[PDB]
C-alpha cells in the first residue's frame, strides 16, 4: 500500500528557509511524478510544482519561479522541496502527492491526477514578537475592540466574570504585520459594563 | 497562474442532488479531458473524487459523478448525506506541463435551514478603524465588500475565516484600518443574498 509521510511542523522567522521531506514506500518511487501542493490556513489548494525522481527534472509554478527547490534522494526514496526567503504568507501546509506514471513518449507530468497525498507539514513563518494589546470600546448592542497583540490566545471577560447571557467574543484575525485583533460583544440601563481582558502579563478594564 | 473559478459555497439537503461548477479557459478546462476533483475535510489532505472529467477511482461511491460542457466542468453529487458536507477543489492540466486548481466550494449540508448574516458595523479614544462584525449565519459562507460613501475600497482590509458558534452556525468579522474617515457601509453577502450596514 502507497504511503507518504511527511517531516514534522516548521517554525521560522523571515528570510529564512525550510526543507520539508518526502518519504514514499509501496510503490516505486522512481516511477511517478511527485508534485508539491500547499494550502494557507482557510485558503485555498495551491500548486508549487513537479518533480522526476528518476531524472531529477523539475518545474515549478511561476509564482514560486527562483525561490523553490525541488530535489529528491532515490536511494532512500525521498523528496525534498525547500522554500526559501521566507514571508508571513508562505505560512502554510505543504503536501506532497504522487502524480502521473513517468513516460518517455507521453509528458505527464502536468495530469493533475493526484491518487495518494503526504500527511502534510505545517510551516509557520512570523516575524512578529510579544506584543501587549490595545483595548478600545464600541436591542441594544455593545462591546469593545482590542487591537494589535501577540501572541494567542487572549481571555476576555465582562464585569469580571458575571455576564454571560448573549456575550459574543469572535476569533482573533490575523493581519499582514503579524498581528492579531479581536472583538467580544454582548439600552434600556443604570449599568456599568467592563470587558475584563487577559493576555504580555496584560490585565486591563474597560467600558 | 489565475485559478479556476469555483462557487465560494453550496448548499443542499440530505437525498437531493448537487452541483458544484468549475470555470477555466479554452486553453485548459476546454482543451482536454484532464480535470480532476477533490474533497477535503477539515485537517486531512485532499481526496481524488473524480478524474479525467468523469471517471471514478474505485472505491469511491457512485453517487459522485462528473461532467463538463465548454470551459466548465461540473461535480455532481447525488443522495446528500452529512459526511458529505467538506470543501471541493477541481483541478486541471494547465498547458506547459503545469497544474492549477479551482479556488474552491464549500460543500454543507443543512441540518438547520439557512440563516441570517446579522451584522453589526461599528465606526470607532483613538480619534482609524472599521469594524464589521458578522455573526449567526449559515451556512458558514460570506464575502464582504466595504464602501467609502458609494465607492468601493479594497486596500487595508482583513477578514477572519469562518467560525463555528455552538447553535452550529458561524461567525466572522472584517476589519477595516484607516486614516478620510472624517459615510461608510459594510456590505456582507450570503448566499448570493447581500447585507448592508451603513455608517
Known amino acids: 500500500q502507497v504511503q507518504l509521510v511527511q517531516s514534522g511542523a516548521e517554525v521560522k522567522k523571515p528570510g529564512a528557509s525550510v526543507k520539508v521531506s518526502c518519504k514514499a514506500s509501496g510503490y516505486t518511487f522512481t516511477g511517478y511524478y511527485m508534485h508539491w501542493v500547499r494550502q494557507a490556513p482557510g485558503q485555498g489548494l495551491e500548486w508549487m510544482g513537479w518533480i522526476n525522481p528518476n531524472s531529477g527534472g523539475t518545474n515549478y509554478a511561476q509564482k514560486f519561479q527562483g525561490r523553490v527547490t525541488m530535489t529528491r534522494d532515490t536511494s532512500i526514496s525521498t523528496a525534498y522541496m525547500e522554500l526559501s526567503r521566507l514571508r508571513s504568507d508562505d505560512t502554510a501546509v505543504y503536501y506532497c502527492a504522487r502524480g502521473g506514471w513517468i513516460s518517455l513518449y507521453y509528458d505527464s507530468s502536468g495530469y493533475p491526477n493526484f491518487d495518494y497525498w503526504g500527511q502534510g507539514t505545517l510551516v509557520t513563518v512570523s516575524g512578529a514578537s510579544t506584543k501587549g494589546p490595545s483595548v478600545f470600546p464600541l436591542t441594544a448592542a455593545l462591546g469593545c475592540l482590542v487591537k494589535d497583540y501577540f501572541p494567542e490566545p487572549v481571555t476576555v471577560s465582562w464585569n469580571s466574570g458575571a455576564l454571560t447571557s448573549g456575550v459574543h467574543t469572535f476569533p482573533a484575525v490575523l493581519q499582514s504585520s503579524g498581528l492579531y485583533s479581536l472583538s467580544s460583544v454582548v439600552s434600556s440601563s443604570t449599568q456599568t459594563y467592563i470587558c475584563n481582558v487577559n493576555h504580555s502579563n496584560t490585565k486591563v478594564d474597560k467600558r | 497562474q489565475s485559478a479556476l473559478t469555483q462557487p465560494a459555497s453550496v448548499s443542499g439537503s440530505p437525498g437531493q442532488s448537487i452541483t458544484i461548477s468549475c470555470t477555466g479557459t479554452?486553453?485548459?478546462?476546454?482543451?482536454?479531458?484532464?480535470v480532476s476533483w477533490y474533497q477535503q475535510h477539515p485537517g486531512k489532505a485532499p481526496k481524488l473524487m473524480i478524474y479525467?472529467?468523469?471517471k471514478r477511482p474505485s472505491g469511491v461511491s457512485n453517487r459522485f459523478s462528473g461532467s463538463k460542457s465548454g470551459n466548465t466542468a461540473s461535480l455532481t453529487i447525488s443522495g446528500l448525506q452529512a459526511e458529505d458536507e467538506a470543501d471541493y477543489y477541481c483541478?486541471?492540466?494547465?498547458?506547459?506541463?503545469?497544474?492549477?486548481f479551482g479556488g474552491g466550494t464549500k460543500l454543507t449540508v443543512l441540518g438547520q435551514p439557512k440563516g441570517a448574516p446579522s451584522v453589526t458595523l461599528f465606526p470607532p479614544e483613538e480619534l482609524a478603524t472599521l469594524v464589521c462584525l458578522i455573526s449567526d449565519f449559515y451556512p458558514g459562507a460570506v464575502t464582504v465588500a466595504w464602501k467609502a460613501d458609494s465607492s468601493p475600497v479594497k486596500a487595508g482590509v482583513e477578514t477572519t475565516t469562518p467560525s463555528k458558534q455552538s447553535n452550529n452556525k458561524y461567525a466572522a468579522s472584517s476589519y477595516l484600518s484607516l486614516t478620510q474617515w472624517k459615510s461608510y457601509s459594510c456590505q456582507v453577502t450570503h448566499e448570493g443574498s447581500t447585507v448592508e450596514k451603513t455608517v
Open positions: 483541478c486541471s492540466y494547465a498547458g506547459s506541463s503545469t497544474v492549477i
Open positions: 479554452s486553453s485548459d478546462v476546454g482543451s482536454y479531458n484532464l
Open positions: 479525467e472529467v468523469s
